[PDB]
Swiss-Prot record, chains A, B:
This is Phenylalanine--tRNA ligase alpha subunit. Binds 2 magnesium ions per tetramer. It catalyses: tRNA(Phe) + L-phenylalanine + ATP = L-phenylalanyl-tRNA(Phe) + AMP + diphosphate + H(+). Tetramer of two alpha and two beta subunits. The gene is pheS.
């Protein structure tokens, strides 16, 4: 006879980090809208993180970002087509550069979504980290309009908070779009707006930087007659309000007691 | 010191059945086109499997299907809205009835995909089973056209066999569509057409059966001013040519030596 209520062999039970969980749900949501997920490098060149995105040096625009500059030789940074790219190395301050990398390597129309680890030299509080995650979205093609950008975010909201959810766009500035916008989604269960990210219609100069770089590389231009929208949102910010996490600093804390609480969450 | 090349603790390693793998890839493909996966019951009523789909008794159409009829009382079969549905019980000869179940329970526009176990009383050879799986697709809404149906299958093909793949539609008969069609996809690596399934524009009488049933249930009509396409394809047939399985009869064989070969395949 056996005491069946007794503890069984202690096999380990794993789990996924909350950021991974949230990233997965976001990617699932945008995959249903036809977006494909691709990643870019964390250590990026000033050209891709800034210049290509219309953010030149010694101007108010640069002063908006808190960049971590790197040093060291022998480091090889490959470009969109495996080429050796040059320029001052840095930690990407956002996922946006992957927006230029993808476009030089592909041809429209397309829909991508790019999650990624980003870095910014700033003070860490309960809603700010120096190391966090963003999700870029980019849809380029003939006839793409801001209504499509609004439609996309509307879908995000519905998918994330149900039918009684809604979105709100307000104008904001980004050297890489025009029109530019910041957006929030209505969280019905919590009764308040959440400022998720920035977006807009890809800037004419960004498309120009892309084809110009394509030419240096010997590729034909590909973005002369197309338009497109792009957005960038905070993964931790969404995870926090979604999984009820009170302090952004927990994410990178490595505390098993914290992590293990998401073994269930998918 | 330790002989690190020695075998480690024999922890078990699992795997998923090939049908599960293939179903997952198909669902992933259609999810990217905006389709949502829902399942229906295996034991179905003659009303949903036939009558609603415009297949009346004692007519050539019925004689096309090899139905397994069931018997026994005390069995409760619930309808789209949990109601108690009546009629001669049977094993569904296809996933198509889920096409009527979903429509009475929801309102257009929408896009569903419904994988499922189906049954047919026929001889089992290397490409025929009495118990196999199908994947229905249904997209209903204002302005839906056959071009959209062709577009869908075109996407399936591209996603399944790459850019050098193509589709072929030929007319065929189904009491539940009009136009009706059968389709094949070009398998570039194998140099030959594969007859995947049937499809067409949902029949006017099917939409009528749906709303008529909705009225009995007290719901307002919902399919008067919409059109839609639907398709049904063989999962095993696609898995076979996709995973190189020579005999359909292996699937339900339960032979571990067979199954374990797909531990890798995702
Ligand atoms: N220090 C920090 N810690 C945690 N999350 C942070 C953060 N700094 C920013 N975030 C999150 O990052 C989101 C976007 O960052 S941002 O600096 O405001 N905007 C950007 O970086 C741009 N790349 C956004 C963008 C705008 C337009 C586009 O077409 C594409 C992208 C914010 O909405 C916020 O939720
Ligand atoms: N006995 C069997 N064993 C294995 N696979 C089988 C089978 N009998 C059929 N199949 C697979 O099932 C697919 C479709 O089955 S079928 O009887 O030809 N067609 C149907 O059942 C219909 N419901 C298809 C359909 C047609 C139009 C629509 O709008 C929706 C669906 C075939 O293309 C074939 O690949």
């Amino acid at each position: 006879r056996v005491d069946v209520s007794l503890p069984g062999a202690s096999l380990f039970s794993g789990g996924l980090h909350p950021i991974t969980l949230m990233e997965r749900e976001l990617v699932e949501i945008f995959r249903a809208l036809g977006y494909q997920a691709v990643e870019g490098p964390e250590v990026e060149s000033e050209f891709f993180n800034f210049d290509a995105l219309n953010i030149p040096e010694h101007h108010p625009a640069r002063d908006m970002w808190d960049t971590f500059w790197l040093t060291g030789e022998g480091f090889r940074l490959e470009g969109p087509l495996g080429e050796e790219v040059e320029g001052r190395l840095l930690l990407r301050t956002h996922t946006s550069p992957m927006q230029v990398r993808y476009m030089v390597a592909h041809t429209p129309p397309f829909r991508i979504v790019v999650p990624g680890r980003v870095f910014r030299f700033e003070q860490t509080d309960a809603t700010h980290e120096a190391v966090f995650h963003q999700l870029e979205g980019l849809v380029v093609g003939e006839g793409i309009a801001m209504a499509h950008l609004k439609g996309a975010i509307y879908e995000l909201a519905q998918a994330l908070f149900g039918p009684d959810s809604k979105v709100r766009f307000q104008p904001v500035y980004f050297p890489f779009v025009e029109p530019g916008a910041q957006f929030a989604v209505w969280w019905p269960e919590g009764g308040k707006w959440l400022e998720l990210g920035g977006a807009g219609m890809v800037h004419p100069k960004v498309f120009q930087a892309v084809d110009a770089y394509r030419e240096r590389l010997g590729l034909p231009p590909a973005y002369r007659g197309v338009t497109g929208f792009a957005f960038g949102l905070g993964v931790e910010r969404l995870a926090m309000l979604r999984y009820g996490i009170p302090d952004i600093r927990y994410f990178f804390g490595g505390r098993l007691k914290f992590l293990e609480q998401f073994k269930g969450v998918l």
